[PDB]
Structures are given as C-alpha cells and as structure tokens.
Amino acid sequence: VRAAQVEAEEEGETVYLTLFLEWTEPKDYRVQPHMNVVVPEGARVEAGDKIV
Amino acid sequence: HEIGQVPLLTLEEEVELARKVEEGMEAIKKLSEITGLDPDLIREVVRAKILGSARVRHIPGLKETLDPKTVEEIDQKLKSLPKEH
DNA sequence: TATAATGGGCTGATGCAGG
Numbered sequence: 001v002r003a004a005q006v007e008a009e010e011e012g013e014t015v016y017l018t019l020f021l022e023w024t025e026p027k028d029y030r031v032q033p034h035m036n037v038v039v040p041e042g043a044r045v046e047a048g049d050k051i052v
Numbered sequence: 053h054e055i056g057q058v059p060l061l062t063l064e065e066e067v068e069l070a071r072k073v074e075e076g077m078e079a080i081k082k083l084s085e086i087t088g089l090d091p092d093l094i095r096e097v098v099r100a101k102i103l104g105s106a107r108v109r110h111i112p113g114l115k116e117t118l119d120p121k122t123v124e125e126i127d128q129k130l131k132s133l134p135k136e137h
Numbered sequence: 138t139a140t141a142a143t144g145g146g147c148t149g150a151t152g153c154a155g156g
Contacts, residue, residue, distance in 0.1 A: 033064045036071060056144055 086137055087129065090115065097126050 005020040029051065031037060037052040045051070061069065080098060084091045093114050100108055100123050108120060116122050 034067050036068065053144080060143055 083130070083137075086133065089126070093126070094130075097123050097130070101127065 001021060001023040003019055004022050007018045007020075009016050009018075031052050035052045039045070039049075039051050076098075080091055080094050083089070083094055087094065092111075093116065096111050096114060096118060100118070105120065108118065108123065110118050
C-alpha cells in the first residue's frame with residue numbers, strides 16, 4: 001500500500017491525515033481442464049473483460 | 053517405434069488441440085466471406101505452409117491448380133488484410 | 138457419428154567391416 005497525496009490538519013496536540021491511498025487487492029480464480037486462459041501474464045483489464 | 057516418438061496427450065493438451073482445430077475451421081469459414089474465396093481452397097492454402105513446401109499438389113475439387121505461384125498470390129492477399137481480419 | 142478405449146505374435150563364389 002502507498003500514499004499519493006497527503007493533506008494534514010492540526011488540532012490540539014494531534015494531526016489528522018486525509019490519506020489519498022493506492023493499493024491492489026488480490027482475488028484468486030481456479031481454472032479447470034476444459035477452460036483456457038485467453039489473457040497473457042501481466043495484462044491490463046477494465047471492468048468486464050474476459051480472463052478465461 | 054515411430055509412433056512411440058509422439059508422447060500421448062493429457063486431458064488438457066487433448067482439449068487444447070481439439071479446441072484449436074475447431075476454432076481454426078471457424079476461422080477459415082469467415083475468411084471465405086471476407087475474401088470472396090472458397091473455404092476448401094483457403095483450407096489447403098493454410099494447409100500448404102504449415103506442412104512445408106515438401107507437400108504441394110493439386111487437391112481434387114479445388115478450382116485452381118495448386119502450385120507455388122497461386123499459393124503465393126493467395127497467401128499474400130490473406131496477409132493483405134486489416135489486422136482485425 | 139460421442140462412457141473409455143492410445144506400441145504385434147548343404148556347397149562354392151564374392152563382397153564386407155575388423156584383427
């Protein structure tokens with residue numbers, strides 16, 4: 001996980017970070033013998049593209 | 053001995069090969085319509101270059117005599133198509 | 138045209154890979 005922009009506000013002896021954070025969440029998919037993966041390693045996909 | 057040289061397929065390799073064969077025939081049917089040519093003739097021209105020029109002959113039923121002249125001309129129209137074709 | 142099936146039942150003349 002990583003932080004792009006950081007905006008900070010100060011109040012009392014505390015600071016509050018509104019973090020513009022950027023990360024990747026993994027999901028595993030199981031392939032079985034009669035299916036073929038039609039996507040290469042490291043391809044970029046939008047919502048709704050076909051993987052296998 | 054010579055058939056013992058080919059390993060036998062696994063269930064996935066079998067379905068992979070079967071897969072590509074059928075999709076390949078669907079390929080050639082649509083290439084008949086784009087092209088205005090004849091599926092059988094396209095089938096043999098595709099056929100020619102996979103095997104090598106070792107085998108090139110007249111195939112019964114095709115309208116053109118199948119010699120390196122026509123398979124070059126027909127192949128280069130095939131390759132003269134847009135990238136999506 | 139569709140379960141799956143995947144490797145057989147005696148002599149002489151001459152031209153050769155080898156001590």
